[model samples]
Target: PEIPGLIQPGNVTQDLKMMVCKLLNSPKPTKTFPGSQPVSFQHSDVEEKLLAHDYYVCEKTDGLRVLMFIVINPVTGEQGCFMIDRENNYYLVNGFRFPRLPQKKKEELLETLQDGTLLDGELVIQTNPMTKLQELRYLMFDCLAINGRCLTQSPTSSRLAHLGKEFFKPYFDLRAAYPNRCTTFPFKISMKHMDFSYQLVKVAKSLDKLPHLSDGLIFTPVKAPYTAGGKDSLLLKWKPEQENTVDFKLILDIPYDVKPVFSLYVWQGGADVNSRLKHFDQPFDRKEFEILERTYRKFAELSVSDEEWQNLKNLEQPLNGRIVECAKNQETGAWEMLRFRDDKLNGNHTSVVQKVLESINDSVSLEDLEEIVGDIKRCWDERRANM
Candidate 1:
């Protein structure tokens, strides 16, 4: 299985290795993303030792999740500073647009962003001062240490907003500060990916199903190449001893609305065999695929409001037991998803389906996106100004 844990700097150090070895040597230790380097501390004292190490880690406190900051210089004592991250990469804009540079000190203080080195070098251990800390698992800070130091800042309430406020202090603040020179400082180090990469090498490759890959359907890895009959089809061939197979052919007549259709099937037979085919309607976990459900409902809702979803459905009709339109390239003859359907049976059936999202609203127009955000801000201000 693929592990999604990020690497911990401690892993590269002998000190971390010794610390982990010592912890494991102890009576109690929990699971670990050893790949992630942080020792899973089940015992309370283990967490204390972690805090003593003077590092920042995602941790739990008071049955609540919080970011534990422990900044120790090994030479100097603890920084003893504490803070919480309220926003994720927030920046201030002047006149509804982000300013490249801060013109006024007040404006600079008011319009702060979680950018550059928000918390780069130093770490601090502090108790939760905010009631809302219980609601957060991770501090959700965006940028990490910059330029070798973790720079931190806190501003006043009159400058920032309440909903934007964490800990109710009226504005954002941090535990300690580092080098002020912007050119030198950078964000904190990111714990992105740890060494846990796995890829599946399916025993039986998905080929031989090119001709009979299912049409109009949802299918899974085990049941690839779902084919819809009506001349719209996919065929398959798999060795009986070395591989398994499944085939489902759904023939829809009586013309009803088919938001989508699925077919699953497999092939069997000898060298000269036309082979018997079996179809299956296996149960699938709907909850696991809630994203599809939500997308479909959203499309239906849009269709009610004169959206294009309904119009597209009305425009195209599935041909009888066979593929009708396999549009050849007017421009680049690229295999079109809308028209390409197979009829012949081939080897172990499986193929990938690629489709495009229906709306450009979901696609960001980079050119005017910032301008649109500014317009939205102006609209918000007007609405709140009257309130």
Candidate 2:
């Protein structure tokens, strides 16, 4: 989408970053981004398991992860829209014109939906069917704070309900009323499409052909509050064994047998490369030795030196200290280094890595999902009455 006032942090002054932190009411207002991540499904046998809590299943649109910060100026009361990128960079996205909620606000939703609202979702790249144009859309799924109230202590369902009734409904009503004004939007916005956890199989059928991309499914507990900096057990991601991935900071020296043995490490304290970054025990490759050269060649097209490309088997390791996404083969049981995460600042955390290993070891199969529907439906009906 063509944002009118999109200013990236590449050249943004110090005042803006600190100003955004001030708008968010951050006490320290430090130079780091505080974002959240979901954990893997640690125990993945869906049947014979009542599970700990209620879950809402949603298709993963593997787009750019972002947080939308609505910074309302105190004196001017101007709503400034900004986006925080995955790497902690902030962008001033100033083309989103929110529709005004009608007098329904005076009756039931007597709270404010204004400034300092932090919305979480993916910045998706969608192809417009009629125009054959690529458009960026925001698929908002979670809210941390709204109406000047911190909702991190509330249940996830309440936040979604607030976002649905308070934000999405108004936009929908206005779009229905006047399609003319809606044309000026920088991008589109919608609630993340979700279904009951039991509808996994049905959701998977259509997910394969979505206009966007998704590597897996996300299972968020309906009753748990928002957990920043990666939820350990409550939030979960569901991916097949083949799609399971972990990003590692790789370090390697020249191999003796004209073959490379990669070393993997993850942050222990955001620590030094040698002292604190913990190393994995085994990094083996039985038959995929040639894939390393292909990786070197891939990056060579970007900016790797000729010596680096030639020395994949001989001497140099260019992708060392670079975050590489690795996926474990479903049947072979060997890890495959897929690609570099150039956009990311660091590798996956130790907890996230361990969680992915657990998922790869004990994944819930589709057939297993089929058997859990009746039970999940029963649980959902009960929970609905309670709500």
Candidate 3:
């Protein structure tokens, strides 16, 4: 998980610190032709001045003749990483821009697959320079936070980009290292990390035991609340008082709430969160997954207007080929003969199979409560047999 050319000490490496100091002191390079060499220079109290500048340099370029920029941490320490965005563009900063789906209340997925169905896109924290473009296809794995903390990297365009690329390589390998400890350290993009913010450890701590909401921005089934005894404290509030009995609730984390937990399942009185919970129980099986994929695609399509539908339509085909279906099957049956090839597959069939399985395990559950436990167990055994 360690990035080869980059350094990460308890703090940042002296080399990075010194390089940042140099970058802080150096005058910006003026605009030059593509093939022209980059112009570089120095300053007297480079270290002191750089340290004073938070070892970042973009602001220093304003009055200077140079046109260069530096990725600077305008604020120091943890505050800088959590609150401020070095990218200047906040939308690009990994925040939720959930374009709501029409008929459904969930956010619409930005990307889809070949089958005209939508694939949920979550923001992934990747530290590894996306060595390949395929990683960006299905999932939106952006390097949101890096090197412990700090939102925007130094602003010197080229240097910031290089630092970004450097920060990217190791970010991808992060995951839950312990209970309640998701080690995929987020880059300093949180409001608390910004310079203007005060203590947010309280906010972060408050979020502790609450059921995790949707990954990235899109909500899913696993995000449900529980009682102290591990029972589901959440209820599925449904509506129409007829045909469908909505059940189970998915918790949505809203900042306005003193408790921070909001229900996502039952809408006022219409759909029961429990009904949707059925989709979350099943195991990872191709046919079932495809059905859910198709269902969600319909969910996404119904939610969007015509234009967005067209865009979603186009995105679906290629991604579906890369994702749905397997690479090869000598087994009998028409479905078994086909394959799902997605750029997101990244050439690893076995792992893709695993992801497909996990996706199934996490998202697709059956509708009938009486058959729930048995259905899941059966599917698990089937998947085990295949494994």
Candidate 4:
């Protein structure tokens, strides 16, 4: 639970109270806080997914999911923001300095923040180009509450406007005034936005060009309110179908078995405690095979003939019983090795796998996507013709 530098020392008892108090003052809302549930790509209908809604698209960065809330200190009555994780635990984030305002106005801002202001975002570490060093950042994507009024029912555009006008603009102004103290702050806020003109193919190809490790694009409907704790069907996420991978449980045959064969098992939903399992026919990578050799003492020390050892080394790809990510190679027509998915224990179920297969079959090729983009371009041109 303690993620070294990320989760600092803090008293949870006080942190929980601060968050709940903000919830208590909110207008009747569905949930106490914005939950981190997102719809999987498998649920998307490729034909209608991106076209039906004017969705906001942003690269999904591989980072920690966090909810940030600005609240009042019960003892000192001072206002401060705290970072909360999915487990309902909180941490005291040090080193952030807020901009100075008039006494009455500052009090009003503090009260507004304390009453109900929650930001749903991700904590990411990006390398600064100048320094070439990693810096912590909070990339805000959605707002759940603000000014004691619930923005959960408001449009995404309105929520974002409030975030910029009420929070980021002032923060940036303060940072501008103090250039030297910029590094003093452990974290900074970066608002995530959508590029309406972006094409699916262009965005997909650009993933490799990005400096950060990003998985795919998050397509969120502009008119939808913040949904917590469950999948919002309106929020469609898309990853390159060819690059898509699945986690599978590795089962190694042991003891007296002459040929050590490996069996791969994938399961339904990750959070399901009693998930059903199905076998997957994908070979693992070399590193995974080495891991298996190292882990099983018998296998590690077992005498092998020179021919057998060389054959083992020469195997195109080996297999281990541990969970791994495997993707189909369209060119080779084989389930090729991708990478290890240590973050998850089991792979997608047969049903989920089938859905992804459907997505793959339904996905538009680069050529088709280009044609659609051309049509969109013509429409944009017609609109701006008179302007």
* Cα-based lDDT for every prediction: 0.22, 0.62, 0.23, 0.56
TM-score of each: 0.19, 0.63, 0.16, 0.64
Ranking by lDDT: 2, 4, 3, 1
- How do the residues 234-348 of candidate 1 rate in per-residue lDDT, one tens digit apiece? 1111111111111212222222453443322222233212212211221332332232222111111000123534655566554212221122222432222232234533222
Q: Write the per-residue lDDT of candidate 3 for residues 1-387, one digit (tens) a residue.
A: 111122234233222233222222322111111111111111222222211222111111111011111133333411111111121111112221112122332222222111101111122233334352222111211121223333223232332333334432222222211222232332221111111001122222333232222111111111221111111212111111111111222222233312222222112322223334554554422344333332221100002245634554544432211232221111221121123334231222233334433332222211212233344335445645775
Off by over 4 Å in 1: 1-70, 73-361, 367-374
Candidate 2's TM-score: 0.63
How well does candidate 3 match the true structure in TM-score terms? 0.16
- Candidate with top TM-score is 4
Comparison by TM-score, 1 against 3, better one: 1
How far residue 27's Cα lies from its native spot in candidate 3, in Å, is: 38
**What is residue 75's positional error in candidate 1, in angstroms?**
11
List, in order, the clash count of every candidate structure: 55, 0, 61, 2
What stretches of model 2 exceed 4 Å from their correct place?
1-5, 8-32, 44-50, 99-113, 128-132, 178-184, 229-232, 245-359, 378-387
Q: Give the per-residue lDDT digits (tens) of candidate 4, residues 327-380.
A: 555554455454666677445575766666666654434444545565545554
- Candidate of highest lDDT: 2
Model 1 residue 359 distance off true place after TM-score fit, in angstroms: 8.7
